[PDB]
Amino acid sequence: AVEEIVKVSRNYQVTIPAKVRQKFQIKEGDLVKVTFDESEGVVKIQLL
Amino acid sequence: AVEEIVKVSRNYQVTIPAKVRQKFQIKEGDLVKVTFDESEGVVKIQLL
């Protein structure tokens, strides 16, 4: 259960912390899909 | 789906777009949980 609690920035960004990036290996410039999940009430971030 | 493709920002930040924020009420300084979901291979952002 790899997870970390973070603060939302002024311009509504969320940092994906190092702990999570060991599993979800994103870099500045990558494209990701950001979806509101209507059954879980969470936001999902998926790699393209 | 309520979703948008976004580019990862410098310093590993991902914008939660306005389209998504209409459903997922977040404000500057809110604390959120960032989780890797192994069943799906995606990151989930959860309100705390």
Author numbering:
A (entry chain B), B (entry chain A): 2 to 49
Paper quotes:
Sso7c4 appears to be the first repressor-like protein described in crenarchaea and may play a regulatory role in gene transcription. The Sso7c4 protein possesses a homodimeric DNA-binding fold that forms a swapped β-loop-β ‘Yin-Yang’ topology, and it belongs to the SpoVT-AbrB superfamily. In our study, Sso7c4 exhibits DNA-binding activity and alters the trajectory of the DNA through bending and bridging.
Here, we present the crystal structure of wild-type Sso7c4, which was resolved at a high resolution of 1.63 Å, to obtain a better understanding of its architectural properties and functions. The crystal of wild-type Sso7c4 contains one homodimer in the asymmetric unit and is in the P212121 space group. Interestingly, the two basic C-termini are disordered owing to a lack of corresponding density. In the wild-type crystal, Sso7c4 makes extensive contacts with neighboring molecules via residues in loop1 (R11, N12, and Y13), the α1 helix (K20, R22, and K24), loop3 (E29) and loop4 (E39). Three sulfate ions, which all bind to the top surface of wild-type Sso7c4, are present in the crystal structure. Two (X201 and X202) are located near the R22 (R22′) side chains, mediate protein-protein interactions, and are solvated by eight water molecules; the third (X203) is close to the β2′ strand on the DNA-binding surface. We believe that the relative positions of these three sulfates on the top surface of Sso7c4 mimic the position of the phosphate backbone of DNA upon complex formation. In contrast, the R11 side chains in the wild-type Sso7c4 crystal structure are stabilized by intermolecular interactions. In addition, the R11 side chain (chain A) of the wild-type protein is further stabilized by PEG 400 through water-mediated hydrogen bonds. The K24 side chain is more ordered in chain A, which is stabilized by polyethylene glycol 400 (PEG 400), similar to the stabilization observed in crown ether binding mode.
